[PDB]
């Protein structure tokens, strides 16, 4: 079924995965794009 | 006995990273609450504390067993092994669960996969109080929650008929306010990630008068009548009346400072600082009136003689009028 397919896909992705190595550990740098949604500026103390 | 076998068979081949029906349909979650106490509503930080018993119930076709027992009743030892929705409160400055003595959680897995998950929370929710009409102001400020990572296509919340049920409403720490009602609401918001189903519970608070009535209103009206007392002292005793006026002004400004120090720094004019400003004006006008009286005694005595008795009637009438106007207006507004 769809749940079994998803489970097998995720188990394949996480199997044989090294956390100590960034993506493209030898080649070019990885590009990390940032978004920020400001909820509140709470208090501004002088 | 056999409950261990059931619990072992439910967690064999179970992935707690995949929501139930990951690729079929959104997960319907029924949310209930139990407001223990609505903590102090401090206006300085525009926040308020609330203590609730948050209950979430959903269907999980993977936690479906077939035995004589109908329901499995469990503590917080099996909460971290099944899928649990990531409900967060969108307007909480700081909130935290309870951990003494054992994590305050409850998990009840019925026979057909229906899961009930209950926990105890203390949320310092945020609400920007519009501090006009102070202290004759009423607020209705919410508690909003929604899923964090799952958009509307994956997690849909839905209130029950008898979802939110307040407690006794008597042992709460609502000092300056008074609980008058609540109402639940469901909407859909747009975020950079997707469309989310945001639920809200609006609590209606009405500021009961009292502390301010006896902290600023009475002191200032009593200062006003103290300033009026100078109108009867004979006009020849200058130092007495000058001391009266100037010390009355000093006390008036001190009381205004305190009254404004009660509530936070707001750049608009409230209804309390308006009152203390009118009282300040009254005191200053009584003092400049005596000043002109003393100045005119040297020029024309009969003018000052008539002016004193004129002021003796003109000041209390103008103050009664002001009061009436002010109070009536704000009570109708
Ligand atoms: C930057 O650094 C920061 C500091 O390092 C860091 O903060 C730390 O974050 C981590 C992770 O987020 C925290 O660790 C988790 O804490 C969870 C609860 O945290 C509350 O409690 C701790 C104190 O923890 C004690 O008390 C609880 C409750 O009794 C115990 O469960 C703990 O084991 C622990 O008990 C020991 O200490 C007690 C004395 O206090 C002793 O009496 C006791 O005997 C033990 O010796 C508080 O410090 C927390 O406060 C902080 O966090 C809150 C969060 O809101 C903040 O608001 C606050 O300001 C503080 O910052 C908080 O109050 C633990 O539940 C959790 O452990 C569970 O999860 C992990 C991961 O899933 C599991 O591996 C683990 O096994 C636990 O799961 C078991 O238990 C749960 C119970 O709910 C079961 O549901 C679950 O199924 C599982 O049971 C299974 O396994 C059991 C064995 O593990 C087994 O017994 C069962 O039978 C079953 O098989 C984890 O410890 C850590 O506390 C934070 N520390 C601090 C100082 O904040 C921060 O994240 C970092 N920032 C970033 C960005 O990285
Ligand atoms: C809490 O939410 C429920 C569900 O939206 C509300 O129950 C509805 O109430 C209206 C009028 O009272 C009825 O017409 C609907 O049929 C009810 N729906 C269901 C599913 O029972 C309830 O009113 C809300 N509580 C409030 C606003 O205090």
Curated annotation (Swiss-Prot), chain A:
Disease in which the protein is involved: Epileptic encephalopathy, infantile or early childhood, 2: A form of epileptic encephalopathy, a heterogeneous group of severe childhood onset epilepsies characterized by refractory seizures, neurodevelopmental impairment, and poor prognosis. Development is normal prior to seizure onset, after which cognitive and motor delays become apparent. IECEE2 is an autosomal dominant condition with variable age at seizure onset, ranging from early infancy to 6 years.
Residues bearing attached sugar chains per UniProt: 2
Coiled-coil intervals: none
Described function: Beta subunit of the heteropentameric ligand-gated chloride channel gated by gamma-aminobutyric acid (GABA), a major inhibitory neurotransmitter in the brain. GABA-gated chloride channels, also named GABA(A) receptors (GABAAR), consist of five subunits arranged around a central pore and contain GABA active binding site(s) located at the alpha and beta subunit interface(s). When activated by GABA, GABAARs selectively allow the flow of chloride anions across the cell membrane down their electrochemical gradient.
Description of its domains: The extracellular domain contributes to synaptic contact formation. GABAARs subunits share a common topological structure: a peptide sequence made up of a long extracellular N-terminal, four transmembrane domains, intracellular or cytoplasmic domain located between the third and the fourth transmembrane domains.
Quaternary structure note: Heteropentamer, formed by a combination of alpha (GABRA1-6), beta (GABRB1-3), gamma (GABRG1-3), delta (GABRD), epsilon (GABRE), rho (GABRR1-3), pi (GABRP) and theta (GABRQ) chains, each subunit exhibiting distinct physiological and pharmacological properties. Interacts with UBQLN1. May interact with KIF21B. Identified in a complex of 720 kDa composed of LHFPL4, NLGN2, GABRA1, GABRB2, GABRG2 and GABRB3.
UniProt-recorded name of the protein: Gamma-aminobutyric acid receptor subunit beta-2
Family, per entry: Belongs to the ligand-gated ion channel (TC 1.A.9) family. Gamma-aminobutyric acid receptor (TC 1.A.9.5) subfamily. GABRB2 sub-subfamily.
Subcellular location: Postsynaptic cell membrane; Cell membrane; Cytoplasmic vesicle membrane
UniProt tissue specificity: Isoform 1 and isoform 2 show reduced expression in schizophrenic brain. Isoform 3 shows increased expression in schizophrenic and bipolar disorder brains while isoform 4 shows reduced expression.
UniProtKB/Swiss-Prot annotation, chain B:
The name this protein goes by in its record: Gamma-aminobutyric acid receptor subunit gamma-2
GO cellular component, one term: postsynaptic membrane
The record's account of how the chain is modified after translation: Palmitoylated by ZDHHC3/GODZ; required for the accumulation of GABA(A) receptors at the postsynaptic membrane of inhibitory GABAergic synapses.
Effect recorded for residue 260 to Q: In GEFSP3 and DEE74; does not affect protein abundance; decreases cell surface expression; decreases current amplitude in response to GABA; increases zinc sensitivity; accelerates deactivation
Effect of residue 219 to S: In DEE74; increases protein abundance; retained in the endoplasmic reticulum decreases; cell surface expression; decreases current amplitude in response to GABA; increases zinc sensitivity; accelerates activation and prolonges deactivation
Domain notes: The extracellular domain contributes to synaptic contact formation.
UniProt source species: Homo sapiens (Human)
Membrane topology qualifier: Multi-pass membrane protein
Reaction(s) this enzyme catalyzes, per UniProt: chloride(in) = chloride(out)
Protein family according to the UniProt entry: Belongs to the ligand-gated ion channel (TC 1.A.9) family. Gamma-aminobutyric acid receptor (TC 1.A.9.5) subfamily. GABRG2 sub-subfamily.
Quaternary state and interactors: Heteropentamer, formed by a combination of alpha (GABRA1-6), beta (GABRB1-3), gamma (GABRG1-3), delta (GABRD), epsilon (GABRE), rho (GABRR1-3), pi (GABRP) and theta (GABRQ) chains, each subunit exhibiting distinct physiological and pharmacological properties. Interacts with GABARAP. Interacts with KIF21B. Identified in a complex of 720 kDa composed of LHFPL4, NLGN2, GABRA1, GABRB2, GABRG2 and GABRB3. Interacts with LHFPL4. Interacts with SHISA7; interaction leads to the regulation of GABA(A) receptor trafficking, channel deactivation kinetics and pharmacology.
Control of this protein's activity: Allosterically activated by benzodiazepines. Activated by pentobarbital. Potentiated by etomidate, propofol, pregnanolone. Inhibited by the antagonist bicuculline. Inhibited by zinc ions. Potentiated by histamine.
Extracellular side: 1-212, 260-271, 331-333
Record's function text: Gamma subunit of the heteropentameric ligand-gated chloride channel gated by gamma-aminobutyric acid (GABA), a major inhibitory neurotransmitter in the brain. GABA-gated chloride channels, also named GABA(A) receptors (GABAAR), consist of five subunits arranged around a central pore and contain GABA active binding site(s) located at the alpha and beta subunit interface(s). When activated by GABA, GABAARs selectively allow the flow of chloride anions across the cell membrane down their electrochemical gradient.
Effect on the protein upon substituting residue 16 to S: Found in a patient with generalized tonic-clonic seizures
Disulfide bridges in this chain: 127-141
